[PDB]
Amino acid sequence: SAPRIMRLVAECSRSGARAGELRLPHGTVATPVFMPVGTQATMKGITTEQLDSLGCRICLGNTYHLGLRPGPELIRKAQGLHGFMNWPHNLLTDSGGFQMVSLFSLSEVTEEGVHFRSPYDGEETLLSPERSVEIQNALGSDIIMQLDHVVSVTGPLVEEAMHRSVRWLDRCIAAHKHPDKQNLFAIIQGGLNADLRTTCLKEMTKRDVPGFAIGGLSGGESKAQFWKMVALSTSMLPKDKPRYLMGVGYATDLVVCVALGCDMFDCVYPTRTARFGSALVPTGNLQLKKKQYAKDFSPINPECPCPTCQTHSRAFLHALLHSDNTTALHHLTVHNIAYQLQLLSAVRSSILEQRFPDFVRNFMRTMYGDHSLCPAWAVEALASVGIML
Partner 1 sequence: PKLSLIKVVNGCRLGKIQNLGDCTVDIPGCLLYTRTGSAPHLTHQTLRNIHGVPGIAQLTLSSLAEHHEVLAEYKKGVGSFIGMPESLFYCSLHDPVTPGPAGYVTSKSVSVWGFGGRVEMTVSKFMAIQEALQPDWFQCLSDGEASCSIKRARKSVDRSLLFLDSCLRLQEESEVLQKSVIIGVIEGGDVMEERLRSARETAKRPVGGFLLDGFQGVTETRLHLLSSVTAELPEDKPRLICGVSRPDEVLECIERGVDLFESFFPYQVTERGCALTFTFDSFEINLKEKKYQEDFDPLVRGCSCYCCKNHTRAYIHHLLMTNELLAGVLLMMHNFEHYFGFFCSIREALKNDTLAQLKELICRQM
Query: Per CB under 8 A, does 223 bind partner 1?
Result: yes
Residue 120 site contact among Zn ion, partner 1, none (CB < 5 to 8 Å, cut-off depends on kind): none
What is the Cα–Cα distance from 98 to 278, expressed in whole angstroms?
A: 28
What is the Cα–Cα distance from 35 to 39, expressed in whole angstroms?
A: 12
Among 2, 224, 294, 388, binds partner 1 (CB under 8 A): 224
What is the Cα–Cα distance from 308 to 291, expressed in whole angstroms?
A: 20
Q: Which of residues 132-161 bind partner 1 (CB under 8 A)?
A: 152-157
372-384 per-residue burial string, b: 16 or more CB within 10 A, e: under 16: eebeebbbebbee
Residue 223 site contact among Zn ion, partner 1, none (CB < 5 to 8 Å, cut-off depends on kind): partner 1
Q: Are strands 27-31 and 18-24 parallel, antiparallel or unpaired?
A: antiparallel
What is the Cα–Cα distance from 232 to 235, expressed in whole angstroms?
A: 5
Q: Which of residues 51-110 bind partner 1 (CB under 8 A)?
A: 103-104, 108
Cis amide bond preceding 375, omega within 30: no
Residue 306 is assigned to a ligand binding site: yes
- Neighbour tally for 165: CB within 10 Å: 25
Q: How big is the chain by its Cα radius of gyration, in Å? A: 21
Residue 157 site contact among Zn ion, partner 1, none (CB < 5 to 8 Å, cut-off depends on kind): partner 1
Report the largest interatomic distance among the alpha carbons of the chain, rounded to a whole angstrom: 61
Residue 309 is assigned to a ligand binding site: yes
Binding range to partner 1, per CB under 8 A, among 44-52, 121-129, 219-227, 315-323: 219-227
What is the Cα–Cα distance from 30 to 21, expressed in whole angstroms?
A: 5
Indicate the residue among 186 and 257 with the shorter CB distance to partner 1.
257
DSSP reduced 3-state for 57: coil
Indicate the residue among 220 and 284 with the shorter CB distance to partner 1.
220
Query: Per CB under 8 A, does 376 bind partner 1?
Result: yes
Min dist CB 381 to partner 1, Å, is 9
Beta bridge partners of 112: none
State the binding string over 157-186 for partner 1 (x if CB under 8 A, else -).
x-----------------------------
Residue 335 site contact among partner 1, Zn ion, none (CB < 5 to 8 Å, cut-off depends on kind): Zn ion
The residues carrying an active-site annotation are 94, 266
List residues near partner 1 by CB under 8 A.
Answer: 103-104, 108, 152-157, 222-224, 228, 375-377, 379-380
Residues of each annotated binding site for queuine = 94-98, 148, 189, 216
